[PDB]
Design an enzyme around this catalytic site. Structure first.
Site, short mmCIF file in Angstrom:
data_model
loop_
_atom_site.label_atom_id
_atom_site.label_comp_id
_atom_site.label_asym_id
_atom_site.label_seq_id
_atom_site.Cartn_x
_atom_site.Cartn_y
_atom_site.Cartn_z
N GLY A 171 0.77 -1.24 0.00
CA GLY A 171 0.00 0.00 0.00
C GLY A 171 0.79 1.28 0.00
N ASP A 173 7.34 -12.04 10.37
CA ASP A 173 8.13 -11.53 9.24
C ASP A 173 9.02 -10.39 9.74
OD1 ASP A 173 9.03 -11.08 6.60
OD2 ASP A 173 7.35 -9.75 6.15
N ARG A 187 13.15 -4.17 6.88
CA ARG A 187 12.17 -3.55 6.02
C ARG A 187 10.83 -3.29 6.71
NH1 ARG A 187 12.89 -8.68 4.42
NH2 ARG A 187 11.19 -10.06 5.07
N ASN A 188 10.57 -3.94 7.85
CA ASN A 188 9.33 -3.76 8.59
C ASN A 188 9.54 -2.92 9.83
OD1 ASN A 188 7.58 -5.17 6.81
ND2 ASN A 188 8.18 -7.11 7.70
N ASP A 190 4.16 -3.94 11.25
CA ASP A 190 3.70 -5.01 10.38
C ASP A 190 3.68 -6.39 11.07
OD1 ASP A 190 4.34 -4.29 6.86
OD2 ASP A 190 3.20 -3.23 8.36
N1 LIG Z 1 4.24 4.96 9.89
C1 LIG Z 1 4.97 5.46 8.89
N2 LIG Z 1 5.58 6.63 9.07
C2 LIG Z 1 6.37 7.13 8.11
C3 LIG Z 1 6.68 6.45 6.95
N3 LIG Z 1 6.07 5.25 6.74
C4 LIG Z 1 6.12 4.35 5.67
C5 LIG Z 1 6.90 4.63 4.43
C6 LIG Z 1 6.18 4.14 3.17
C7 LIG Z 1 7.03 4.35 1.90
C8 LIG Z 1 8.41 3.72 2.02
C9 LIG Z 1 9.44 4.17 0.98
C10 LIG Z 1 10.70 4.52 1.76
C11 LIG Z 1 10.29 4.55 3.21
O1 LIG Z 1 10.96 4.94 4.15
N4 LIG Z 1 9.03 4.10 3.30
C12 LIG Z 1 8.26 3.94 4.55
N5 LIG Z 1 5.34 3.30 5.89
C13 LIG Z 1 4.79 3.49 7.16
C14 LIG Z 1 3.83 2.49 7.65
C15 LIG Z 1 2.55 2.91 8.00
C16 LIG Z 1 1.63 2.00 8.50
C17 LIG Z 1 2.01 0.68 8.72
C18 LIG Z 1 0.96 -0.25 9.22
O2 LIG Z 1 -0.22 -0.07 8.94
N6 LIG Z 1 1.41 -1.20 10.06
C19 LIG Z 1 0.67 -2.15 10.77
C20 LIG Z 1 -0.73 -2.24 10.69
C21 LIG Z 1 -1.37 -3.22 11.44
C22 LIG Z 1 -2.84 -3.37 11.36
F1 LIG Z 1 -3.46 -2.38 11.97
F2 LIG Z 1 -3.28 -3.34 10.11
F3 LIG Z 1 -3.26 -4.50 11.88
C23 LIG Z 1 -0.61 -4.00 12.31
C24 LIG Z 1 0.76 -3.82 12.35
N7 LIG Z 1 1.40 -2.89 11.62
C25 LIG Z 1 3.29 0.26 8.38
C26 LIG Z 1 4.20 1.17 7.88
O3 LIG Z 1 5.44 0.84 7.42
C27 LIG Z 1 5.86 -0.58 7.35
C28 LIG Z 1 6.66 -1.03 8.52
C29 LIG Z 1 7.33 -0.73 7.22
C30 LIG Z 1 5.18 4.73 7.67
#
Ligand SMILES: Nc1nccn2c([C@@H]3CC[C@H]4CCC(=O)N4C3)nc(-c3ccc(C(=O)Nc4cc(C(F)(F)F)ccn4)cc3OC3CC3)c12
Ligand SMILES: Nc1nccn2c([C@@H]3CC[C@H]4CCC(=O)N4C3)nc(-c3ccc(C(=O)Nc4cc(C(F)(F)F)ccn4)cc3OC3CC3)c12
Length: 266
Positions: free
Chosen positions: A21, A128, A132-133, A146
Protein backbone atom coordinates in the site's frame (compact mmCIF):
# COMPACT_ATOMS: atom_id res chain seq x y z
CA UNK A 1 -14.84 0.84 17.86
CA UNK A 2 -11.41 1.77 16.44
CA UNK A 3 -12.99 3.43 13.39
CA UNK A 4 -11.50 6.81 12.53
CA UNK A 5 -13.70 9.04 10.42
CA UNK A 6 -11.66 9.51 7.15
CA UNK A 7 -13.19 13.00 6.87
CA UNK A 8 -10.99 13.88 9.88
CA UNK A 9 -7.79 13.38 7.84
CA UNK A 10 -5.80 16.12 6.05
CA UNK A 11 -3.29 14.59 3.56
CA UNK A 12 -0.02 16.54 3.44
CA UNK A 13 2.68 14.50 1.72
CA UNK A 14 3.00 11.38 -0.37
CA UNK A 15 5.60 9.11 1.32
CA UNK A 16 5.69 6.57 -1.46
CA UNK A 17 4.83 2.98 -1.92
CA UNK A 18 5.55 0.62 0.91
CA UNK A 19 4.84 -3.05 1.17
CA UNK A 20 1.07 -3.62 0.45
CA UNK A 21 0.00 0.00 0.00
CA UNK A 22 0.69 3.69 -0.49
CA UNK A 23 1.44 5.75 2.61
CA UNK A 24 0.80 9.43 3.24
CA UNK A 25 1.80 11.79 6.00
CA UNK A 26 -1.05 13.93 7.29
CA UNK A 27 -2.97 15.32 10.25
CA UNK A 28 -5.98 14.09 12.21
CA UNK A 29 -8.53 16.78 13.22
CA UNK A 30 -6.12 19.48 11.97
CA UNK A 31 -3.48 18.95 14.67
CA UNK A 32 -2.09 15.46 15.18
CA UNK A 33 0.59 13.95 12.95
CA UNK A 34 -0.34 10.55 11.58
CA UNK A 35 0.74 8.12 8.85
CA UNK A 36 -2.14 6.98 6.68
CA UNK A 37 -1.61 3.65 4.92
CA UNK A 38 -4.02 2.74 2.12
CA UNK A 39 -4.07 -1.04 1.94
CA UNK A 40 -3.78 -2.21 -1.63
CA UNK A 41 -7.13 -3.54 -2.98
CA UNK A 42 -7.16 -7.35 -3.35
CA UNK A 43 -3.89 -7.89 -1.44
CA UNK A 44 -5.27 -8.95 1.97
CA UNK A 45 -7.84 -11.35 3.42
CA UNK A 46 -9.91 -8.35 4.46
CA UNK A 47 -12.30 -9.58 7.13
CA UNK A 48 -9.57 -11.53 8.96
CA UNK A 49 -7.20 -8.57 8.58
CA UNK A 50 -9.67 -6.01 9.97
CA UNK A 51 -10.65 -8.25 12.91
CA UNK A 52 -6.96 -8.72 13.86
CA UNK A 53 -6.17 -5.03 13.31
CA UNK A 54 -8.84 -4.15 15.89
CA UNK A 55 -7.42 -6.64 18.42
CA UNK A 56 -3.96 -5.09 17.80
CA UNK A 57 -5.30 -1.61 18.64
CA UNK A 58 -4.95 -2.80 22.30
CA UNK A 59 -1.12 -3.15 21.91
CA UNK A 60 1.02 -0.26 23.07
CA UNK A 61 4.76 -0.05 23.56
CA UNK A 62 7.26 2.76 23.07
CA UNK A 63 9.20 0.60 20.53
CA UNK A 64 6.17 -0.56 18.53
CA UNK A 65 4.70 1.74 15.90
CA UNK A 66 1.46 2.74 17.59
CA UNK A 67 -1.78 1.84 15.83
CA UNK A 68 -4.39 4.60 16.20
CA UNK A 69 -7.37 3.32 14.23
CA UNK A 70 -8.71 2.11 10.90
CA UNK A 71 -11.06 3.36 8.19
CA UNK A 72 -12.95 0.36 6.81
CA UNK A 73 -16.23 1.83 5.46
CA UNK A 74 -14.70 2.34 1.99
CA UNK A 75 -11.99 0.83 -0.22
CA UNK A 76 -9.07 1.04 0.11
CA UNK A 77 -9.01 0.42 3.87
CA UNK A 78 -6.87 2.94 5.72
CA UNK A 79 -4.70 2.15 8.74
CA UNK A 80 -3.88 5.23 10.87
CA UNK A 81 -0.61 4.94 12.83
CA UNK A 82 2.21 6.80 14.51
CA UNK A 83 4.14 8.87 11.98
CA UNK A 84 7.83 7.86 11.75
CA UNK A 85 9.56 10.81 10.13
CA UNK A 86 12.80 9.03 9.24
CA UNK A 87 11.05 6.24 7.37
CA UNK A 88 11.99 2.61 6.88
CA UNK A 89 14.96 1.27 8.87
CA UNK A 90 16.37 -0.54 5.85
CA UNK A 91 16.57 2.66 3.76
CA UNK A 92 17.98 4.52 6.77
CA UNK A 93 20.81 1.98 7.35
CA UNK A 94 21.75 2.13 3.63
CA UNK A 95 22.35 5.92 3.74
CA UNK A 96 26.09 6.10 4.42
CA UNK A 97 25.83 9.82 5.28
CA UNK A 98 24.61 8.91 8.79
CA UNK A 99 28.10 7.65 9.79
CA UNK A 100 26.59 5.63 12.59
CA UNK A 101 28.60 4.80 15.70
CA UNK A 102 28.36 1.13 16.72
CA UNK A 103 26.69 2.30 20.00
CA UNK A 104 23.87 3.68 17.77
CA UNK A 105 23.62 0.35 15.91
CA UNK A 106 23.40 -1.53 19.21
CA UNK A 107 20.67 0.90 20.41
CA UNK A 108 18.68 0.10 17.22
CA UNK A 109 19.00 -3.61 18.06
CA UNK A 110 17.85 -2.93 21.62
CA UNK A 111 14.83 -0.92 20.40
CA UNK A 112 13.71 -3.90 18.27
CA UNK A 113 14.47 -6.36 21.05
CA UNK A 114 12.31 -4.46 23.56
CA UNK A 115 9.44 -4.34 21.06
CA UNK A 116 9.69 -8.10 20.42
CA UNK A 117 9.88 -8.99 24.11
CA UNK A 118 6.67 -6.94 24.55
CA UNK A 119 4.91 -8.68 21.59
CA UNK A 120 5.96 -12.08 22.92
CA UNK A 121 4.67 -11.20 26.39
CA UNK A 122 1.23 -10.47 24.77
CA UNK A 123 1.28 -13.89 22.94
CA UNK A 124 1.92 -12.31 19.48
CA UNK A 125 4.47 -13.52 16.96
CA UNK A 126 5.77 -11.10 14.35
CA UNK A 127 6.23 -13.87 11.66
CA UNK A 128 8.13 -11.53 9.24
CA UNK A 129 10.61 -9.59 11.36
CA UNK A 130 13.19 -7.78 9.18
CA UNK A 131 14.66 -4.25 8.81
CA UNK A 132 12.17 -3.55 6.02
CA UNK A 133 9.33 -3.76 8.59
CA UNK A 134 10.91 -1.34 11.09
CA UNK A 135 10.61 2.47 11.00
CA UNK A 136 12.67 5.35 12.45
CA UNK A 137 11.14 8.42 14.09
CA UNK A 138 12.53 12.03 14.12
CA UNK A 139 14.62 11.25 17.22
CA UNK A 140 16.29 8.19 15.58
CA UNK A 141 14.29 5.67 17.69
CA UNK A 142 13.59 2.43 15.80
CA UNK A 143 10.17 0.80 16.17
CA UNK A 144 8.68 -2.40 14.85
CA UNK A 145 5.60 -2.59 12.65
CA UNK A 146 3.70 -5.01 10.38
CA UNK A 147 3.61 -7.63 13.18
CA UNK A 148 1.49 -10.59 12.21
CA UNK A 149 0.31 -9.22 8.86
CA UNK A 150 1.88 -11.92 6.66
CA UNK A 151 -1.01 -14.14 7.80
CA UNK A 152 -3.46 -12.13 5.63
CA UNK A 153 -1.48 -11.82 2.39
CA UNK A 154 -3.33 -13.32 -0.57
CA UNK A 155 -0.39 -13.44 -3.03
CA UNK A 156 0.99 -17.02 -2.82
CA UNK A 157 4.49 -15.76 -3.81
CA UNK A 158 4.71 -14.36 -0.23
CA UNK A 159 3.05 -17.13 1.80
CA UNK A 160 4.97 -20.39 1.48
CA UNK A 161 8.71 -21.24 1.57
CA UNK A 162 8.61 -22.14 -2.16
CA UNK A 163 7.48 -18.52 -3.11
CA UNK A 164 9.63 -15.77 -4.71
CA UNK A 165 8.65 -13.20 -2.04
CA UNK A 166 8.85 -15.48 1.00
CA UNK A 167 11.45 -14.18 3.53
CA UNK A 168 13.81 -17.16 3.01
CA UNK A 169 16.79 -15.08 4.20
CA UNK A 170 15.15 -14.41 7.62
CA UNK A 171 13.91 -17.99 8.17
CA UNK A 172 15.24 -20.78 10.38
CA UNK A 173 15.67 -24.33 9.08
CA UNK A 174 12.41 -25.62 10.66
CA UNK A 175 10.46 -22.90 8.79
CA UNK A 176 12.07 -23.67 5.43
CA UNK A 177 11.81 -27.46 5.84
CA UNK A 178 8.49 -27.86 7.65
CA UNK A 179 6.69 -24.45 8.09
CA UNK A 180 7.26 -24.68 11.92
CA UNK A 181 6.63 -21.05 13.17
CA UNK A 182 7.14 -20.16 16.82
CA UNK A 183 8.68 -17.60 19.14
CA UNK A 184 12.01 -19.26 18.09
CA UNK A 185 11.50 -18.45 14.40
CA UNK A 186 11.05 -14.78 15.46
CA UNK A 187 14.29 -15.11 17.46
CA UNK A 188 16.15 -16.35 14.36
CA UNK A 189 14.77 -13.45 12.29
CA UNK A 190 15.84 -11.00 15.02
CA UNK A 191 19.39 -12.29 14.76
CA UNK A 192 19.26 -11.68 10.97
CA UNK A 193 17.89 -8.20 11.69
CA UNK A 194 20.89 -7.48 14.00
CA UNK A 195 23.07 -8.65 11.09
CA UNK A 196 21.22 -6.25 8.74
CA UNK A 197 21.83 -3.39 11.18
CA UNK A 198 25.52 -4.06 11.72
CA UNK A 199 25.98 -4.57 7.94
CA UNK A 200 24.34 -1.17 7.21
CA UNK A 201 21.47 -2.74 5.36
CA UNK A 202 23.24 -5.32 3.19
CA UNK A 203 20.94 -8.06 1.97
CA UNK A 204 21.54 -11.18 4.15
CA UNK A 205 23.49 -13.82 2.11
CA UNK A 206 23.94 -11.06 -0.51
CA UNK A 207 26.03 -13.26 -2.87
CA UNK A 208 23.46 -16.13 -2.80
CA UNK A 209 20.04 -16.69 -4.28
CA UNK A 210 17.11 -17.69 -1.99
CA UNK A 211 17.50 -21.33 -3.15
CA UNK A 212 21.24 -21.27 -2.31
CA UNK A 213 20.48 -19.62 1.08
CA UNK A 214 18.06 -22.41 2.01
CA UNK A 215 20.73 -25.00 1.06
CA UNK A 216 23.38 -23.13 3.07
CA UNK A 217 21.21 -23.12 6.18
CA UNK A 218 20.34 -26.85 5.51
CA UNK A 219 24.10 -27.60 5.62
CA UNK A 220 24.22 -25.90 9.08
CA UNK A 221 26.06 -22.85 7.74
CA UNK A 222 25.30 -19.29 8.64
CA UNK A 223 25.89 -15.63 8.03
CA UNK A 224 29.28 -14.43 9.27
CA UNK A 225 30.44 -11.45 11.26
CA UNK A 226 29.71 -7.97 9.95
CA UNK A 227 32.78 -5.69 10.02
CA UNK A 228 31.12 -3.33 12.49
CA UNK A 229 30.14 -6.04 14.97
CA UNK A 230 32.42 -6.76 17.92
CA UNK A 231 33.01 -10.34 18.95
CA UNK A 232 30.38 -10.01 21.72
CA UNK A 233 27.77 -8.47 19.36
CA UNK A 234 28.43 -11.28 16.87
CA UNK A 235 28.01 -13.87 19.66
CA UNK A 236 24.54 -12.40 20.43
CA UNK A 237 23.29 -12.47 16.83
CA UNK A 238 24.82 -15.93 16.24
CA UNK A 239 23.06 -17.31 19.32
CA UNK A 240 19.76 -16.64 17.46
CA UNK A 241 20.76 -19.20 14.79
CA UNK A 242 21.14 -22.41 16.69
CA UNK A 243 19.97 -25.34 14.55
CA UNK A 244 17.85 -26.51 17.54
CA UNK A 245 15.06 -23.95 18.11
CA UNK A 246 14.96 -24.81 21.86
CA UNK A 247 18.65 -23.74 22.23
CA UNK A 248 17.93 -20.24 20.90
CA UNK A 249 17.49 -17.55 23.59
CA UNK A 250 14.35 -15.61 24.48
CA UNK A 251 13.90 -11.92 23.79
CA UNK A 252 14.28 -11.19 27.55
CA UNK A 253 17.66 -13.01 27.53
CA UNK A 254 18.76 -11.19 24.36
CA UNK A 255 17.82 -7.87 25.96
CA UNK A 256 19.99 -8.65 29.00
CA UNK A 257 22.85 -9.66 26.63
CA UNK A 258 22.55 -6.43 24.66
CA UNK A 259 22.52 -4.26 27.81
CA UNK A 260 25.59 -6.10 29.12
CA UNK A 261 27.46 -5.39 25.86
CA UNK A 262 26.37 -1.76 25.98
CA UNK A 263 27.86 -1.39 29.46
CA UNK A 264 31.03 -3.19 28.43
CA UNK A 265 31.62 -1.59 25.01
CA UNK A 266 31.69 1.73 23.13
N1 LIG B 1 4.24 4.96 9.89
C1 LIG B 1 4.97 5.46 8.89
N2 LIG B 1 5.58 6.63 9.07
C2 LIG B 1 6.37 7.13 8.11
C3 LIG B 1 6.68 6.45 6.95
N3 LIG B 1 6.07 5.25 6.74
C4 LIG B 1 6.12 4.35 5.67
C5 LIG B 1 6.90 4.63 4.43
C6 LIG B 1 6.18 4.14 3.17
C7 LIG B 1 7.03 4.35 1.90
C8 LIG B 1 8.41 3.72 2.02
C9 LIG B 1 9.44 4.17 0.98
C10 LIG B 1 10.70 4.52 1.76
C11 LIG B 1 10.29 4.55 3.21
O1 LIG B 1 10.96 4.94 4.15
N4 LIG B 1 9.03 4.10 3.30
C12 LIG B 1 8.26 3.94 4.55
N5 LIG B 1 5.34 3.30 5.89
C13 LIG B 1 4.79 3.49 7.16
C14 LIG B 1 3.83 2.49 7.65
C15 LIG B 1 2.55 2.91 8.00
C16 LIG B 1 1.63 2.00 8.50
C17 LIG B 1 2.01 0.68 8.72
C18 LIG B 1 0.96 -0.25 9.22
O2 LIG B 1 -0.22 -0.07 8.94
N6 LIG B 1 1.41 -1.20 10.06
C19 LIG B 1 0.67 -2.15 10.77
C20 LIG B 1 -0.73 -2.24 10.69
C21 LIG B 1 -1.37 -3.22 11.44
C22 LIG B 1 -2.84 -3.37 11.36
F1 LIG B 1 -3.46 -2.38 11.97
F2 LIG B 1 -3.28 -3.34 10.11
F3 LIG B 1 -3.26 -4.50 11.88
C23 LIG B 1 -0.61 -4.00 12.31
C24 LIG B 1 0.76 -3.82 12.35
N7 LIG B 1 1.40 -2.89 11.62
C25 LIG B 1 3.29 0.26 8.38
C26 LIG B 1 4.20 1.17 7.88
O3 LIG B 1 5.44 0.84 7.42
C27 LIG B 1 5.86 -0.58 7.35
C28 LIG B 1 6.66 -1.03 8.52
C29 LIG B 1 7.33 -0.73 7.22
C30 LIG B 1 5.18 4.73 7.67
N1 LIG C 1 -4.14 1.41 22.84
C1 LIG C 1 -3.63 1.17 24.07
N2 LIG C 1 -3.88 -0.02 24.62
C2 LIG C 1 -3.32 -0.32 25.80
C3 LIG C 1 -2.46 0.51 26.49
N3 LIG C 1 -2.23 1.76 25.98
C4 LIG C 1 -1.46 2.81 26.38
C5 LIG C 1 -0.70 2.82 27.67
C6 LIG C 1 -0.86 4.10 28.49
C7 LIG C 1 -0.14 3.96 29.84
C8 LIG C 1 1.34 3.74 29.59
C9 LIG C 1 2.19 3.39 30.81
C10 LIG C 1 2.77 2.00 30.54
C11 LIG C 1 2.25 1.58 29.20
O1 LIG C 1 2.47 0.52 28.63
N4 LIG C 1 1.52 2.59 28.69
C12 LIG C 1 0.79 2.56 27.41
N5 LIG C 1 -1.60 3.83 25.55
C13 LIG C 1 -2.41 3.39 24.52
C14 LIG C 1 -2.77 4.34 23.45
C15 LIG C 1 -1.74 5.03 22.81
C16 LIG C 1 -2.02 5.91 21.78
C17 LIG C 1 -3.34 6.23 21.48
C18 LIG C 1 -3.59 7.27 20.43
O2 LIG C 1 -2.84 8.24 20.31
N6 LIG C 1 -4.72 7.11 19.70
C19 LIG C 1 -5.24 7.96 18.72
C20 LIG C 1 -4.45 8.94 18.12
C21 LIG C 1 -5.03 9.72 17.13
C22 LIG C 1 -4.25 10.83 16.54
F1 LIG C 1 -4.39 11.94 17.24
F2 LIG C 1 -2.96 10.57 16.53
F3 LIG C 1 -4.57 11.09 15.30
C23 LIG C 1 -6.35 9.51 16.77
C24 LIG C 1 -7.06 8.52 17.42
N7 LIG C 1 -6.53 7.73 18.37
C25 LIG C 1 -4.38 5.59 22.14
C26 LIG C 1 -4.09 4.72 23.19
O3 LIG C 1 -5.07 4.07 23.93
C27 LIG C 1 -6.42 4.60 23.85
C28 LIG C 1 -7.45 3.56 24.11
C29 LIG C 1 -7.23 4.02 22.73
C30 LIG C 1 -2.83 2.13 24.75
Amino acid sequence: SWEIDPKDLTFLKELGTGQFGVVKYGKWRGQYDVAIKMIKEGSMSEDEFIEEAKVMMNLSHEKLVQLYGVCTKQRPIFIITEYMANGCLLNYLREMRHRFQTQQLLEMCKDVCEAMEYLESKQFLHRDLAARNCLVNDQGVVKVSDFGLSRYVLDDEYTSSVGSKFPVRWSPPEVLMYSKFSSKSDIWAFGVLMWEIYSLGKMPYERFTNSETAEHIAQGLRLYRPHLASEKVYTIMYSCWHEKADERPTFKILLSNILDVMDEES
